[PDB]
Amino acid sequence: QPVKESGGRLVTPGTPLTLTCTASGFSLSSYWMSWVRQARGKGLEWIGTATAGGSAWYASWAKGRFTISRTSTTVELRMTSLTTEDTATYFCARDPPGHSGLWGRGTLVTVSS
Amino acid sequence: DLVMTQTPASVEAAVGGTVTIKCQASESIGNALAWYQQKPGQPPKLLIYDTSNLASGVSSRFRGSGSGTQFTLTISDLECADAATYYCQTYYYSGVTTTYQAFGGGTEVDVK
Amino acid sequence: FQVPQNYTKANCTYCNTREYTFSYKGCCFYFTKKKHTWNGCFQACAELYPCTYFYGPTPDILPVVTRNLNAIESLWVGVYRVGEGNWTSLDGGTFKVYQIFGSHCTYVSKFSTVPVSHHECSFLKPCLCVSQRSNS
Amino acid sequence: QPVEESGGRLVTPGTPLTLTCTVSGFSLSTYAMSWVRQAPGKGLEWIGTISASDTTYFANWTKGRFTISKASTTVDLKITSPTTEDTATFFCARFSAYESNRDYFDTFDPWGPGTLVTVSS
Amino acid sequence: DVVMTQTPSPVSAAVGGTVTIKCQASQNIYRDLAWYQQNPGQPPKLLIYGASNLASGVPSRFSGSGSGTEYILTISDLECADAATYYCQCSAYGSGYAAHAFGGGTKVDIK
C-alpha cells in the first residue's frame, strides 16, 4: 500500500548500483520524492531530494557520487564509487511530512568486497 | 550546512511517567521540525509535524513544542510500546535557492 | 486546448515560512520570479514548492492579491475555459471575468477588479502559486 | 455612517423574524459582512458570515436557524424560529483586512450600533 | 472548533498603572488574535490585531504579544476612561471552511 523498493543486491566497489522506488495507488508526478539512508543502528542521514521533471538536490556528504533521477512511473537512484562504510538500508518517502507522509520498508544496500 | 543536536544521549524513566528530549539547531529554523519514533526493524513512524501538530495515531500524550532555534518533545505517560529511538528532523524546500533537510543524533529511551 | 491532466490540486499541505509574499485565510501565496508563459505556469508552480498548484483568485481573496503589487507589473492567474463557458479554476467554482478576446489566458494588475483576458499569451509574466497551511 | 442596523421588535417565540443592516460608502461586493449575537449581560458569539461572493457559513452551534441574504445595498438576516435564549442585541460587522509585514489578518473593524431583539409574551 | 479561555472576572489596579490580561487558546492559530473593548452600551472597537500589532488610531501605550496558544494583552499608563471590558478573538481557517470565536473578558479598573 505505501511505496515499495528493491534492488539491494550486495555487490563489489567501483560498480554502478541502481535503486527502484515504485508506485502504488497514488500518483508520483504530484509529490516530490527523497532518499534517506541508515547504517546498522545509527542515526539516519539524508541523501537527496528530487522533484518531478528534472531538478534535484544532494547533500554535501557525496560530491555527486549519487545521481538521483525522475521518471513518471518510478524514481531511481544511481551510485558510482560506493565504498566500505557506505552500507545501509535505503529508504524513499514523500517529502512534505504530515498526514500524507508515507515510508517504504527499506532495502538492504550492503557493500561486499 | 545545518546541523542538529539531541544532547540527551539515552534516558531512563518510570512506567507511566515523563520524559523530555531537546533538539537544538544552529540557525533559526523558523518553526519547521519533525519527530519520528522507530521500533527495531521497521520504518520510522511520523509522530509530529511542524513543531507541534499530531499525525494520525498519536494520542495527545505525545506533544512537543518550542520556537526559534531550540525545541523539545514531551511524552505524557510512558507505556509498554514507547521504548524506541526518537529522531528529530528539520526540513526546507525552496526550488529557487536550496533544498535540504537534516536529521539528528538519536535518543534511545527505556522504562523500568 | 485542455488542462494537461497531470497538474492537479494538492491533497497535502506545506508552505515555507521564509520566502512567501503574503498570506491570507490559511494559504501561503507565492509570486514567481522567472516570467514563464501562461501554458507553462502549471508546471512552474508545481516545481517551485511541494503541495503547490497554479491558482485563480476568488472575489474575496482578490483585493489582497492586487494590493501587494506595483503599479506596472502584471500577473497570470489560473482560470480557463475547458468547454464553451463557465470559467473555472483548478480549485473549482465559477468566476466573472472582463472578456475581450478569447483563448484561455488571464491576468490581473493593480487597478484590476476581476481577472481580465489577454490576447497573445506568448508573452512572459510572473505567475501566482498558492499552498494551504497546516490545518488541512 | 459605514453600517447601521434595523428591525428590533418584541414577540413570543416561533414567529418568523428578519433584520437587516444597511451599508454606505463602499461596495459590499468586495468586502464581507458578518453577524454576532451579544446576549444582555453576556459576551459575544459569532453567528455567521456572508462572503464577497454569495457563499456563506455559520458556526456549529447554529442549527440552520440563522440564514443570511445579500441584497443590492444591504445584507438581510433571516431568523426561522427564535426562542427565549435568542433575546439579545445583534451587531452587523465588516471583515477588514489589515496587515503586518508579509501577513494579512482578518478583523471586525467597523461595528454598527446594533438593535435590541426581545422576547416577552 | 477553537475554544478560548481568558482570565476570570474581577480585574483592577490603581488609577494610572499597568494591567495585564491573558487569553489562552486550544490549538495553534499562528499569531492570529484580535483584542476588542466595549463600553457598556457601546459596540466593540478594534485595539490590537495580529496578536502583536497596534491598530490604526489606537494610542501607542497598548502592548500585546505572545505566541503559540497563550497570549497577553498589557496596558501601560492607564486612563480613567479605559475602564470597560476587554475581549479576545481568534480565527481559524480550514481547507474549505472558516470559523471564528470569542471569549468573555471584564472591566479593568475601580480602586
Return the CATH number at A67. 2.60.40.10
DSSP tag of B74: E
Q: In whole angstroms, what is the distance from residue A87 CA to residue A110 CA?
A: 4
Terminal-to-terminal C-alpha distance of chain C: 32
- Domain, as residue range, for A10: 5-109
**Alpha helix (H) ranges present in C15-134?**
41-46, 62-65
Q: Show which residues on chain C lie within 8 Å of chain A, measured between beta carbons.
A: 6, 8, 10-14, 43, 46-47, 50-51, 134
Q: In whole angstroms, what is the distance from residue C17 CA to residue E70 CA?
A: 21
DSSP tag of C18: S
Which H, E and C letters describe chain A, residue by residue? CCCCEECCCCECCCCCEEEEECCCCCCCCCCCEEEEEECCCCCCEEEEEECCCCCEEECCCCCCCEEECCCCCCEEEEECCCCCCCCEEEEEEECCCCCCCCECCCEEECECC
Name the residue type at position E29: I
Please judge whether D29 and C59 are an interchain contact, meaning their C-beta atoms are less than 8 angstroms apart: yes
Residue closest to B6 by CA, chosen among B102, B106, B75: B106
Strand E45-49 and strand E53-54: pairing? antiparallel
Which residues share a beta bridge with A88?
A109
CB C107 within 8 A of CB C75: yes
Cell of D46: 459569532
Resolution (A): 3.6
Phi first, then psi: give them for residue A93, nearest 5 degrees.
-155, 165
Q: In whole angstroms, what is the distance from residue C22 CA to residue D104 CA?
A: 7
Between the alpha carbon of residue B58 and those of residues A24, A99, B90, the distances in Å are 25, 11, 20
**Alpha helix (H) ranges present in chain C?**
41-46, 62-65
Please judge whether C12 and A32 are an interchain contact, meaning their C-beta atoms are less than 8 angstroms apart: no
Q: In whole angstroms, what is the distance from residue A70 CA to residue D43 CA?
A: 57
Chain B residues with CB under 8 Å of A32 CB are 93
How many C-beta atoms surround the C-beta of residue A113 within 10 A? 7
In a mutational test of the C interface, the residue from B28, B29, B50 whose CB has the highest number of chain C CBs within 10 Å is B50
Which value, to the nearest 10 degrees, does the dihedral of the CA atoms of residues C80, C81, C86, C92 take?
A: -50
- Sequence length of chain D is 121
Cell of A68: 538521483
Closest approach of chain B CAs to the CA of C14, in angstroms?
9
Chain E residues with CB under 8 Å of D44 CB are 44, 87, 89, 102
Please judge whether B52 and E28 are an interchain contact, meaning their C-beta atoms are less than 8 angstroms apart: yes
Domain at E4-100, CATH class: mainly beta
In a mutational test of the B interface, the residue from C49, C129, C135 whose CB has the highest number of chain B CBs within 10 Å is C49
Chain E residues with CB under 8 Å of D100 CB are 50, 52-53
Long-range Cβ contacts of D59-66 (<8 Å, 24+ apart): D59/E1, D59/E99, D59/E100, D60/E1, D66/D35
Cell of E34: 484580535
User: Which of A36, A43, A106 faces B106 most closely, judged by CB atoms?
Assistant: A43
* Exposure b/e, C6-25, CB count within 10 A at least 16 = b: ebeebebbbbbeeebebbbb
Cell of A46: 539524508
Please judge whether A43 and B46 are an interchain contact, meaning their C-beta atoms are less than 8 angstroms apart: no
Cell of D40: 444582555
Q: Which chains touch E (3 or more CB pairs under 8 A)?
A: B, C, D
- Burial class for E99, CB neighbours closer than 10 Å (0-12, 13-18, 19+): middle
Please judge whether B31 and C50 are an interchain contact, meaning their C-beta atoms are less than 8 angstroms apart: no
CB E104 within 8 A of CB E3: no
Q: In whole angstroms, what is the distance from residue B77 CA to residue B17 CA?
A: 4
Terminal-to-terminal C-alpha distance of chain E: 38
Solved using: cryo-EM
Q: In whole angstroms, what is the distance from residue E104 CA to residue E111 CA?
A: 22
Cell of E91: 480565527
Which residues share a beta bridge with B64?
B73
Name the residue type at position B105: G
Check if D1 contacts E (Cβ < 8 Å): no
Size of interface A-C (CB pairs under 8 A): 33
DSSP tag of B96: S
Which H, E and C letters describe B23-67, residue by residue? EECCCCCCCCEEEEECCCCCCCEEEEECCCCECCCCCCCEEEEEE
Between the alpha carbon of residue C50 and those of residues A72, A100, C15, C57, D32, the distances in Å are 16, 12, 8, 20, 31
Check if C132 contacts E (Cβ < 8 Å): yes
Q: In whole angstroms, what is the distance from residue D24 CA to residue D74 CA?
A: 9
- Burial class for B112, CB neighbours closer than 10 Å (0-12, 13-18, 19+): exposed
Check if C17 contacts B (Cβ < 8 Å): yes
Domains by residue range for chain D, with CATH: 8-95+106-111 (2.60.40.10)
Check if D51 contacts C (Cβ < 8 Å): yes
Please judge whether D106 and C20 are an interchain contact, meaning their C-beta atoms are less than 8 angstroms apart: no
How many C-beta atoms surround the C-beta of residue E96 within 10 A? 10
CB C32 within 8 A of CB C48: yes
How many C-beta atoms surround the C-beta of residue A94 within 10 A? 22
User: Which of C20, C58, C64 faces D97 most closely, judged by CB atoms?
Assistant: C64
Chain A residues with CB under 8 Å of C134 CB are 98
Q: In whole angstroms, what is the distance from residue C78 CA to residue C97 CA?
A: 12
Q: In whole angstroms, what is the distance from residue A90 CA to residue A36 CA?
A: 6
- Burial class for B10, CB neighbours closer than 10 Å (0-12, 13-18, 19+): exposed
Domains by residue range for chain B, with CATH: 10-109 (2.60.40.10)
Between the alpha carbon of residue D102 and those of residues B39, C20, C24, C28, C68, the distances in Å are 42, 8, 10, 10, 9
Q: In whole angstroms, what is the distance from residue B107 CA to residue D84 CA?
A: 59
How many C-beta atoms surround the C-beta of residue E32 within 10 A? 19
Q: Which residues contact E18 (CB under 8 A, 6 or more apart)?
A: E74, E75, E76, E77, E78
Chain B residues with CB under 8 Å of E28 CB are 52-53
User: Which of B30, B93, B96 faces C50 most closely, judged by CB atoms?
Assistant: B93
Q: Which residues contact B31 (CB under 8 A, 6 or more apart)?
A: B50, B51, B67, C17
Which residues share a beta bridge with D70?
D75
Specify the 3-state DSSP secondary structure of B106.
coil
> Cα C31–C32–C34 angle (5° rounding)?
155
How many C-beta atoms surround the C-beta of residue A108 within 10 A? 11
Specify the 3-state DSSP secondary structure of D42.
coil
Strand B10-11 and strand B85-90: pairing? unpaired
Name the residue type at position E15: V
Instruction: Specify the number of domains making up chain A.
Output: 1
Terminal-to-terminal C-alpha distance of chain A: 35
